[PDB]
Structure 1
Amino acid sequence: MASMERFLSVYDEVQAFLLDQLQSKYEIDPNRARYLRIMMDTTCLGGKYFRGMTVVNVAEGFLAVTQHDEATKERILHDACVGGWMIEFLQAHYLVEDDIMDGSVMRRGKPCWYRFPGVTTQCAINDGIILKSWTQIMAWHYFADRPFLKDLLCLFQKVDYATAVGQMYDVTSMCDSNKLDPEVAQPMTTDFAEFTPAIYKRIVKYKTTFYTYLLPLVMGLLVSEAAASVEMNLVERVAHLIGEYFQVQDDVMDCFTPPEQLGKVGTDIEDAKCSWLAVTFLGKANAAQVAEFKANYGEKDPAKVAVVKRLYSKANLQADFAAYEAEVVREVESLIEQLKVKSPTFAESVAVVWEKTHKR
């Protein structure tokens, strides 16, 4: 059976389980079940399923080199699909909540969930809470007897927490750290002194890389009972490296990719985000260019946004990106080589993860 169709069939199965359990154990009525069914589909489906399918792909790799009864192969693949959906539902939670937090309009070419006429923010905040709660309902049901349950739950929690911490780093990235204070309304930074590579790295590591790259890779190892086929420090290093590169692409595309292909109107400049573009620009600008950036960044005024984009274009950031990319290629290849000492199979799953990121 093809991996994607297996993964999609498991979605339908998990959805049916969750809704049927709501009816049998939580007293749900059919109309609210339908609302939640639509909410699940609208918030969980429509992406590429890169994260969930990486769990499946890692598990598939180990199945090719490990002796198992057929029924065991099917159990491992089913577990990998359920684990994958846990990650996809975790992402769905964070997308719903982040779109509300940021006042976003569109995502993947459709209105953000909270903007649907029959949803509203009051409902959508709680819908997002339910989405993450479903990840745990899945795990406790499908993985109840599994030897990896404890390790899986502990990892999933740490990744969830890291993502929330990353969200805090992101939403506060345009404020001066020494001025953070719940009692006092927060001004935007004027010096941009915290727009550094190391601080940018910290936002991205926590907000993006743990859930997008580390969690799918390690979840694939866990459901395969294969954590001894890897040096975990290498897995973390390669996950953080590829994840940062992924976010850099995303930051570049926010500014320069047309809205129709982006599926949204990018607002990183108006939002004063600590983006790779802003950090790299400030790392090469002269005094006059810095001053012009300061006078225009973080303002909705389309003229000032236009000034920032022209500053980026004139600054030849394409060349900094090519140098960054070449360095990432160097390091990802080195880590893939270190991963072969213990598992050619896992190293190849990482190579596939890298190829799908680098040529997306």
Structure 2
Amino acid sequence: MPMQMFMQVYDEIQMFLLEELELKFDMDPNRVRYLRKMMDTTCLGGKYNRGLTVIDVAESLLSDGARRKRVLHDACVCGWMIEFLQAHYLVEDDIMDNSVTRRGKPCWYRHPDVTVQCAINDGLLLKSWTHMMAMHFFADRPFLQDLLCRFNRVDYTTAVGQLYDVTSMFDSNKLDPDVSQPTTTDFAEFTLSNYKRIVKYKTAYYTYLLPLVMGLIVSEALPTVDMGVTEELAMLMGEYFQVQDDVMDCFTPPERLGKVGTDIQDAKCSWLAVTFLAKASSAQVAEFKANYGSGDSEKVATVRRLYEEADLQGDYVAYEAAVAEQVKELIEKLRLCSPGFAASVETLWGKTYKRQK
């Protein structure tokens, strides 16, 4: 049912946007249908976990069935703002990471009749829609300002996190626009501390904290919860969530994930990379620096192998257990003064813990 009306509001939004493009932007049918396909390919195709969470939080907190419908509808729009925001990130992300597949299908910039230059712009259009839809529905809403302040900061912090992610192969001390530099060879920068910063900003905020806050805002209950504990949980579940993505990027079959990993080729500072270098032996670390950050398959195979050889799946489990009980503890601290919020928060966790996706 949540998923039912979630798709109903999607159609509203798609109608409003595309129609306006024809009525107020002098757009021709061919281009109007192109945006439809671009929208559907990039926004539909996922499990909508960020969007659906907003509804759950809103519903779980609204405790005259109009107030219920008001909060419900708004929660769905706020739901699609993040889904569209995620749609925006992934389009640009796939481009930057030179990815091939996304959600079982080719990445947007990989579509035969979608140019890279146009893909970039579509990615921007996606971001502009979040604002366009919000302004259309929340027009006369007391929280409109607060909603967008927090929405944009999260977007901003996520872009910053992508700065950290995109520039982790480079010795930050040799980071100067006017002078080039190649992939690091010592990987001194590949530290858990540098990994944690990357993940906290590029993933955590928009994937866990944002969905929670928007649901709290439409529910007019933000001041009721302990924003501090809530923040601690969002960062914790966020990191964990990203650590999973990193392992799945290397071990989960492309068809089960719906995308072909590029971390090894892109010499990304993944969790698997910083955890390996931290425990591996002289020879292991050497064979790594010699085969990492390359497209060659025997070079790629080597890095995959070396990961297994080093048994990272065991470090993972210990990490997962650490988080699992750290999350449980925080939720109990939250459950004390806000049981309604506590429940919705645990559902988000349960959707994360040991996911295969």
Q: Output the TM-score relative to the length of structure 1.
A: 0.96
**RMSD of aligned Cα (Å):** 1.1
CA shift, 1:354, in A, is 0.3
Q: For residues 257 and 4 of structure 1, what CA distance do their matches in structure 2 show?
A: 27
Which residue identity is paired with 1:190? T
Q: For residues 99 and 285 of structure 2, what CA distance do their matches in structure 1 show?
A: 28
Find 1:174's aligned residue among 152, 169, 172.
169
1:246 aligns with 2:245: no
Which residue identity is paired with 2:141? R
Which residue identity is paired with 1:125? I
| Corresponding residue of 2:129 | 134
Bigger mean CA offset, 231-240 vs 19-28:
19-28
| Corresponding residue of 1:146 | 141
| Corresponding residue of 1:164 | 159
For each residue in 1:159-181, what CA deviation from the matched residue of structure 2 results, as whole angstroms up to 9, or x when unmatched?
11111111111111111000111
Bigger mean CA offset, 303-312 vs 85-94:
303-312
1:53 aligns with 2:48: no
Alignment length, in residue pairs?
A: 355
CA shift, 1:326, in A, is 0.8
Q: For residues 46 and 260 of structure 1, what CA distance do their matches in structure 2 show?
A: 14
Q: Is the 8 A contact 2:236 2:323 kept in 1?
A: yes
2:267 is paired with a residue of what secondary structure? coil
Q: For residues 41 and 33 of structure 2, what CA distance do their matches in structure 1 show?
A: 12
Find 2:227's aligned residue among 232, 240, 248.
232
| Corresponding residue of 1:12 | 11
| Corresponding residue of 2:315 | 320
CA shift, 1:264, in A, is 2.3
Bigger mean CA offset, 260-269 vs 278-287:
260-269
For each residue in 1:238-281, what CA deviation from the matched residue of structure 2 results, as whole angstroms up to 9, or x when unmatched?
00100111111111111111222122221211111101111111
1:121 aligns with 2:120: no
Which residue identity is paired with 2:31? R
Which residue identity is paired with 1:358? Y
Q: For residues 264 and 20 of structure 1, what CA distance do their matches in structure 2 show?
A: 33
Alignment of 1:199-238 (within 5 A): 199-238=194-233
| Corresponding residue of 1:337 | 332
1:352 aligns with 2:347: yes
Q: For residues 95 and 267 of structure 1, what CA distance do their matches in structure 2 show?
A: 14
Find 1:87's aligned residue among 64, 82, 86.
82
For each residue in 1:79-100, what CA deviation from the matched residue of structure 2 results, as whole angstroms up to 9, or x when unmatched?
0000000000011111111111
For each residue in 1:20-44, what CA deviation from the matched residue of structure 2 results, as whole angstroms up to 9, or x when unmatched?
2222222222221111111110110
CA shift, 1:136, in A, is 0.3
CA shift, 1:225, in A, is 0.3
Q: For residues 310 and 24 of structure 1, what CA distance do their matches in structure 2 show?
A: 57
CA shift, 1:295, in A, is 1.3
Q: For residues 354 and 65 of structure 2, what CA distance do their matches in structure 1 show?
A: 35
Which residue identity is paired with 1:223? V
Q: Is the 8 A contact 2:50 2:207 kept in 1?
A: yes
Q: Is the 8 A contact 2:99 2:261 kept in 1?
A: no
Q: For residues 348 and 42 of structure 2, what CA distance do their matches in structure 1 show?
A: 24
1:304 aligns with 2:303: no
Q: For residues 123 and 265 of structure 1, what CA distance do their matches in structure 2 show?
A: 23
Taking only the aligned residue pairs, the percentage that are identical comes to: 71
Which residue identity is paired with 1:37? R
| Corresponding residue of 1:21 | 20
Alignment of 1:36-115 (within 5 A): 36-63=35-62, 66=63, 69-115=64-110
Q: Output the TM-score relative to the length of structure 2.
A: 0.97
2:141 is paired with a residue of what secondary structure? coil
Classify 1:348/1:280 alpha carbon distance in 2 versus 1 (closer, same or farther; 3 Å): same
2:351 is paired with a residue of what secondary structure? helix
Q: For residues 265 and 153 of structure 1, what CA distance do their matches in structure 2 show?
A: 34
For each residue in 1:3-56, what CA deviation from the matched residue of structure 2 results, as whole angstroms up to 9, or x when unmatched?
110101000011101112222222222221111111110110000000000000
Find 1:187's aligned residue among 150, 175, 182.
182
Q: Is the 8 A contact 2:99 2:260 kept in 1?
A: no
Q: For residues 297 and 110 of structure 2, what CA distance do their matches in structure 1 show?
A: 24
CA shift, 1:184, in A, is 2.1
CA shift, 1:337, in A, is 1.0
Q: Is the 8 A contact 2:55 2:75 kept in 1?
A: yes
Which residues of structure 2 form unaligned runs of 5+?
A: none
Which residue identity is paired with 1:32? R
Q: Is the 8 A contact 2:190 2:269 kept in 1?
A: yes
Bigger mean CA offset, 291-300 vs 86-95:
291-300
Q: For residues 121 and 309 of structure 2, what CA distance do their matches in structure 1 show?
A: 45
Q: For residues 159 and 211 of structure 1, what CA distance do their matches in structure 2 show?
A: 6
Displaced runs of 4 or more, over 4 A:
none
